[PDB]
Design a protein around this ligand. Structure first.
Ligand SMILES: *[C@@H]1O[C@H](CO)[C@@H](O[C@@H]2O[C@H](CO)[C@@H](O[C@@H]3O[C@H](CO[C@H]4O[C@H](CO)[C@@H](O)[C@H](O[C@H]5O[C@H](CO)[C@@H](O)[C@H](O)[C@@H]5O)[C@@H]4O)[C@@H](O)[C@H](O[C@H]4O[C@H](CO)[C@@H](O)[C@H](O)[C@@H]4O[C@H]4O[C@H](CO)[C@@H](O)[C@H](O)[C@@H]4O)[C@@H]3O)[C@H](O)[C@H]2NC(C)=O)[C@H](O)[C@H]1NC(C)=O
Ligand SMILES: *[C@@H]1O[C@H](CO)[C@@H](O[C@@H]2O[C@H](CO)[C@@H](O[C@@H]3O[C@H](CO[C@H]4O[C@H](CO)[C@@H](O)[C@H](O[C@H]5O[C@H](CO)[C@@H](O)[C@H](O)[C@@H]5O)[C@@H]4O)[C@@H](O)[C@H](O[C@H]4O[C@H](CO)[C@@H](O)[C@H](O)[C@@H]4O[C@H]4O[C@H](CO)[C@@H](O)[C@H](O)[C@@H]4O)[C@@H]3O)[C@H](O)[C@H]2NC(C)=O)[C@H](O)[C@H]1NC(C)=O
Ligand SMILES: *[C@@H]1O[C@H](CO)[C@@H](O[C@@H]2O[C@H](CO)[C@@H](O[C@@H]3O[C@H](CO)[C@@H](O)[C@H](O[C@H]4O[C@H](CO)[C@@H](O)[C@H](O)[C@@H]4O)[C@@H]3O)[C@H](O)[C@H]2NC(C)=O)[C@H](O)[C@H]1NC(C)=O
Ligand SMILES: *[C@@H]1O[C@H](CO)[C@@H](O[C@@H]2O[C@H](CO)[C@@H](O[C@@H]3O[C@H](CO)[C@@H](O)[C@H](O)[C@@H]3O)[C@H](O)[C@H]2NC(C)=O)[C@H](O)[C@H]1NC(C)=O
Ligand SMILES: *[C@@H]1O[C@H](CO)[C@@H](O)[C@H](O)[C@H]1NC(C)=O
Lengths: 591, 590, 595
């Protein structure tokens, strides 16, 4: 009596579950045949216009220190770095200990090395030219006698092939199908709480995979009041991600003209060393307009003193250790950079223009968690400049307690992983099922978004939304990205690239759960009607979920998304009752 | 009308041989966070919940099961899965090095040092090492030139084994992609090819424990209540017959000495592991076995020898020389290989009238193996610190009939060695892959309980039971199929390994196209469920002319397509055109 | 007669030109399976013998020769097939060392050599007995008796795995379901023209995936006279080709007995060179009768006249360079040939404006070949012991223009070589690929026994083409398992080494592009609501602004291929505006259903 069971195929309630993302690009504005080691010649053309609807009443917590998109792309970029390294040739025989003298200049930085090597198998020997500097050469047995690479005693070094470019491209991570992506718009979300002003979106936004440490550049601005985030403070063994509103923009350059000379080793082997030099050489200085840097720190200390009992807070430079960890390591214009940040944190303040960062460049790049493999870049000819907006910092607080009640800050840096978190804090993946379970007691203006929040009604419009979200679940051209008819004719690409793993992965996923819904409904009730009541039977013998309809007319689908996790037996027993009700009727017309 | 009103039928135990590829199935019992230190398996990534299967006991039927398709798939899979491990593993780059080998205190021919005089790959320095070595690993000249070198150097390259990985088996379960079935013969008293009397079916296999075994069958499965040997060609002396055992035979083996481990640096990412040093006692590894049980057991087996095949005399000569592997008994346990001179087992001779202490065997260890069908593949193992004690159940013996003259001695059964192919044949001896076409056609005379159910009777309603079979296919949540809940999540992050999931996605993508491939005919015929889909076609008796009785109760439906469903294919087209010329007349004229 | 509802159609046999991944077919694997080594170079699925090819001699649209699709896509295929077989083979790396060579005497083509070789660990051989041809060495100096490998600047070091042979297998390309291959039963129109008699074909006829220079082997024939294929600025300067009307054939010789000596190199590697020669050597030579050459070559003049009025002709020899297209290039016997055509084109024809009836060819062979489109990696070819006799048919040649004015009333046709692309671009000329858009839109009709195949109603009778739609479904885009799953489950699963060849990854790509289409078309049929039927009518008045045509022109004699280009402009309109009008009655339908 009263049936108490309906599937309600039109219900927008989610499951907090990871999946595999879907990759995308926007190379339709560029189409450069140089392949841009991230972009790898144009993933898929982006959408012309994405859509969002604010979902005002949902207030879900998002621990951004538990987001799987952090770790999932963490393997992806390394693998993208791993793949595009692989075909290009490696410096295996070039590991010989070498003599090396400095250049005529400063302070004896640049060093011209000479060395024997049997490059070819044609038995070659010659004192070959090689130009370096003191950041890649370790000395052996004395400061002045012997010289060798700081790596290749242990690691593996490889010359990346010069054709591809180190220019980060604004991409879109995007979800394949069915399951979607959430967005936190209200400000001051420190990363451990709930958030408000929440909308959803299919592809994220223009994400830029930048890699430099000790600062954050070309990231977002969040043009409001300043906010700073960290997983923890009292656990002082954590780190602080700083975010900044005011777009500080810093220009940097290489102060000299350079050429490209190659060492022709053997088959397919043309080692590109530092060719030559014309002019004088500087330390590639960076000027900041310090009055902004004098300014914006005073913004920070106000929004930090409050979090630690209006108490003394100061800045000290970081300690010793590793060049990737304490030095401002930097990459723009393709070529890498190190910069001494001591002129920025010599600043201890407690409440009442031009600059020179003597910078360095770095060629061979080790891993960040291993000792195994190391990547090498060729020198780029001529001069180069780079100017970019800088937004947000990376800071830690030292754990030792002093006898003043003050806090020493030393700048964080040394991880790939949390660098991407700053672009991901607004976002959360969620898994979508249109499935539902809700008893019926009743008779037996457009929202594009995937939520309507008024779960007190099933039926005023809460049925009508996923009707429109079913229109997502089938799409060909410009609705669904993958089933776009033009690119499928275009895509005769091999799958051995990380693309062809990730590309069809989404497509085989998209089809199967589309059929997975389709089978599981079709054996149990066809979707010709959205509400499945052929007097499908009542459940109050073991459901017993004590409620009446008018309090279901004032509720959310909150308990409704946690009835049949305790009682999924109810879901299964309607299947056999579907099986039991059909096994008597059809064979009755048979015999 | 008694005119043949054709009608489709969805749900019928239609069989055919097929050659498909399968998924794995196991438990998180011995998981312990090793899908990488385990073996090739990756701990068998998907999950077997529960062997909820139902067998069938209706009919006897010919199957000739010794000619199957699982066996050669397993030959490709495991060797590939062996390749999967060693591909990130390093390569021994100095191979045919000088190796000044000697050892102090002359048991002789024991473990020796060999003193590398090598150059590293990075620098240009020449250095000296110590390295412990068995006798079975080197090849000298003249016994005093110290010309010992690694045996498989001139064959091919030799790798190390990425020493963090173990070597135990795990009982796995081959599960077919659904829409299929797996058949098995368990009516007792049965051997090899020919018919059986049991139509018992399963969805997944039992716990195959795939150890690559030598001469004896090692903790696989025991036989039935009676010792039986499987059916082969008893002529031709080249079928290498194998007999199972009713009882189990138990043997434990152990190296008495304990050993340490060193690490020798070679080059970039090349720290090579060898035996460090030995503590005190240097006794050889032996293997003891109660001969009184062994004296008993062979008495049983020669009874089944003479009576089933030539009852006169039998001489167990040992196998003669040749292969270093086929002669001795190369046992694996503890993640460790060792060979065994089993000559102290077959010095027996048997007759009928004149018939009716725990022997120990000296075994010995080799550090190098080789591919058996190929010269191109060779492997190491890391020396395991300390001591290893592990036992084993013996489950069967591999036999070879020889001889050209017999009046002196009628039977020469030398202990047969393996091919590596037959070890699966020892365990896949009763299985067969069967595709199902659930659709089928037969006349109607009206126009317009287990997993297979009755292979003999009529279908009152048992087709409907075949539908829940046919629609579990991509449930996604329902736990019998593969449950697709942890089964999705275990692979969706790590499909990038591409050794086992490439089966699984191909298992996926085959399952869906057999779904739609069965749907497309249903979609075109407009049946779309309803399980019977009556039409109105008067069909000629050009094919079958029998009365309404015997077509309908006296005969079955597996035989039905064999007996007169012949050069048809056009019967499909006849019901195809009928519906279109119906609906066009129904819609744009009526 | 003015209800004028639109009607959905599924299976109107239309097509558009597209690009698609390919899919093999070779049922000769079931015929002969000698070894799995040519099959390692050429692994393929077996299909149904006796397919159904249906002739539709009404539609005669233009066939884009010289811009055709498949010439591109298979070209990059075969390089990867050659790359796939080469990668696990060894790389003869340290043999770039200089080679002290002496002359074997009993010309001076073949030469014995000796050099230093460092092995695996430690052994040094003084005089390795290495035997070499003339045309694989370079003098470091002219008076120097030391010689070096020619292309050893780059990766010459690859040598083939010697258990593998190199013999062509009749292969057939297939597109997956939803697609079709076309073929021109019109008798030898031109290069680039619309031809009348055409047909459908699922998978093409036998192809020998071979390579040749100024020559074509085992191709097709002309049922008519000799025909040619060309284009516009070919008449300015670009290579044209030759298709002879009937096959002439040569039988081309071997030297003698050969011996396959192995040379130890290192750990997992062993180089193979010619050990020993039994007897004295005759050069390899081909036999061909000049009378067969004489009779056909005047027909070439008849064709050069059927083009350039009746002007006379001179065949000077090809060029003064390019050692790869100055001679011939065969692969039979697992061996690469070169034959000087100097003795062949001592020809010039009559001004119409006999000794030794058979002719021999002084020929040579090289052990080392090299790719051309990129300077780089190169293959060594192993010696073949025994006898290397060979014979094949000649069916075609390739020719240049030689633009210019010298005598002002003559022309030179020095024979054309070419790239690798032309050899297929020759014999793929009848063939082109289309897709199917089986969804159809045409307005309603006012009124409320012979076999055809794939496109059997698409030729003509377009109102009557509305009958029999499902033959355009059942096997054509339905029946995914037709040759994609039917007979391949064993043998192309039986030992595919490393499980991912170039064919299977296409085949993986093949099966999904079927169902992505098939679900995706069903997706729209999901959205369109009229699903579970074949045709259906919605409730929207077709405005005459789309087509003010009289209804008899539609349902009797106007082609669906030009019907669609008339509706083409308003396609994105109807697709949107009718499903929302469907959604307009649907949002009232739940208002009728729920409320
Ligand atoms: C964070 O984001 C910021 C913001 O995007 C990045 O900073 C940008 O970095 C990009 C590249 O990294 C800069 O674009 C490059 O600028 C080069 C310098 O151009 C200036 O000088 C030239 C000559 O004096 C002027 O003509 C330029 O004026 C033009 O560009 C400006 C800026 O858009 C326009 O406003 C003007 O109207 C002009 O259109 C600039 O004043 C520039 O050389 C370079 O262009 C070459 O490279 C591109 C591909 O990169 C080629 O397609 C193109 O053909 C050029 O190639 C020629 O020159 C090179 C030079 O070596 C030769 O090698 C070639 O052979 C060929 O001759 C490109 O436009 C951009 O200016 C800069 N902007 C700012 C505000 O910083 C940061 O890099 C980024 N960092 C991180 C960590 O994310
Ligand atoms: C255009 O198309 C046509 C057809 O469409 C092509 O014609 C083909 O041309 C090739 C090349 O000539 C032929 O294949 C090769 O033939 C070689 C000659 O074989 C004959 O001589 C040898 C030596 O005396 C005999 O042994 C042969 O007889 C044996 O084989 C035939 C046929 O199988 C049987 O009937 C006999 O009973 C014998 O069994 C012939 O008389 C031949 O040497 C060569 O063969 C080997 O390679 C395969 C693996 O690839 C081995 O399995 C096989 O056993 C042979 O291997 C031996 O020889 C090699 C040589 O080095 C050694 O390395 C091995 O270790 C082993 O000792 C191959 O068969 C082909 O027959 C012919 N087909 C037709 C229909 O004419 C044109 O080539 C083609 N042209 C172009 C440009 O594409
Ligand atoms: C141009 O298209 C037309 C169709 O529009 C096409 O016509 C077909 O031509 C062939 C060849 O003349 C005909 O086929 C013959 O049919 C008879 C039976 O009626 C068979 O006996 C013949 O078989 C013999 O000859 C075959 C070789 O042609 C042998 O293979 C065979 O073993 C037998 O010896 C043969 O099949 C066919 O009937 C006509 N079709 C019609 C409609 O008339 C013509 O082929 C097309 N031309 C091009 C170049 O494709
Ligand atoms: C190929 O296409 C042609 C035309 O595209 C088809 O021929 C046409 O067939 C129709 C139907 O048979 C003919 O209409 C009838 O013609 C007869 C003869 O005059 C007449 O008596 C009838 O009253 C009716 O009008 C039509 O005339 C004819 N036209 C032409 C140009 O042939 C042909 O059937 C198609 N065949 C194949 C194999 O594709
Ligand atoms: C310039 O370099 C040369 C050669 O190394 C050296 O002898 C000389 O002292 C240098 N001079 C200056 C001004 O640095």
């Amino acid at each position: 009596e009263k049936l108490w069971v309906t599937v309600y195929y039109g219900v927008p309630v989610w499951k907090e579950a990871t999946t595999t993302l879907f990759c995308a690009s926007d190379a339709k504005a560029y189409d450069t045949e140089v392949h841009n080691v991230w972009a790898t010649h144009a993933c898929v053309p982006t959408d012309p216009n994405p859509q969002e609807v604010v979902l005002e009443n949902v207030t879900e917590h998002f621990n951004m220190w538990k987001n799987n998109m952090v770790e999932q792309m963490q393997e992806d970029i390394i693998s993208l770095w791993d793949q595009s390294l692989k075909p290009c040739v490696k410096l295996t025989p070039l590991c010989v200990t070498l003599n090396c003298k400095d250049v005529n200049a400063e302070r004896g930085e640049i060093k011209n090395c000479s060395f024997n090597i049997t490059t070819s198998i044609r038995d070659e020997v010659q004192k070959e030219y090689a130009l370096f500097y003191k950041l890649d050469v370790v000395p052996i047995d004395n400061n002045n006698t012997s010289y060798r690479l700081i790596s290749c005693d242990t690691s593996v070094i490889t010359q990346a092939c010069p054709k591809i470019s180190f220019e980060p491209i604004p991409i879109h991570y995007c979800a394949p199908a069915g399951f979607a992506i959430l967005k936190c718009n209200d400000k001051t979300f420190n990363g451990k709480g709930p958030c408000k002003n929440v909308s959803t979106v299919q592809c994220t936004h223009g994400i830029r995979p930048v890699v430099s440490t000790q600062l954050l550049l070309n990231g977002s601005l969040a043009e409001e009041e300043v906010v700073i985030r960290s997983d923890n403070f009292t656990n002082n063994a954590k780190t602080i991600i700083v975010q900044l509103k005011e777009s500080v923009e810093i220009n940097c350059t290489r102060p000299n003209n350079n050429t490209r000379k190659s060492i022709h080793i053997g088959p397919g082997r043309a080692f590109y060393t530092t060719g030559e030099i014309i002019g004088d050489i500087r330390q590639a200085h960076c000027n900041i307009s310090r009055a902004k840097w004098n300014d914006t720190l005073k913004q920070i200390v106000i929004k930090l003193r409050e979090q630690f009992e209006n108490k003394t807070i100061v800045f000290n430079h970081s300690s010793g250790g590793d060049p990737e960890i304490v030095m401002h390591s930097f990459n723009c214009g393709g070529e890498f950079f190190y910069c001494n940040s001591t002129q920025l944190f010599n600043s201890t303040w407690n409440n009442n223009n031009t600059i020179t960062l003597p910078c360095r460049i770095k060629q061979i790049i080790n891993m960040w968690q291993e000792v195994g493999k190391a990547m090498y870049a060729p020198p780029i000819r001529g001069q180069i400049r780079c100017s970019s907006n800088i937004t947000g910092l990376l800071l830690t607080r030292d754990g030792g307690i002093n006898e003043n009640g003050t806090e020493i800050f030393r700048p964080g840096g040394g991880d790939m992983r949390d660098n991407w978190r700053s672009e991901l804090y607004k976002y959360k993946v969620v898994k979508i099922e249109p499935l539902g379970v809700a008893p019926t007691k009743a008779k037996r203006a457009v929202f594009l978004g995937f939520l309507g929040a008024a779960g007190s009604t099933m039926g005023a419009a809460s049925m009508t939304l996923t009707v429109q979200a079913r229109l997502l679940l089938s799409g060909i051209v410009q609705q669904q990205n993958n089933l776009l008819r033009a690119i499928e004719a275009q895509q005769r690409m091999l799958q051995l690239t990380v693309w062809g793993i990730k590309q069809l992965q989404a497509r085989v996923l998209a089809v199967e759960r589309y059929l997975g819904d389709q089978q599981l409904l079709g054996i149990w009730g066809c979707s010709g009607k959205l509400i499945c009541t052929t007097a499908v039977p009542w459940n109050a013998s073991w459901s017993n979920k004590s409620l009446d309809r008018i309090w279901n007319n004032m509720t959310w689908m909150e308990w409704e998304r946690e009835i049949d996790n305790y009682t999924s037996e109810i879901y299964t027993l309607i299947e056999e009752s579907q099986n039991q009700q059909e096994k008597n009727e059809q064979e009755l017309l048979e015999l």
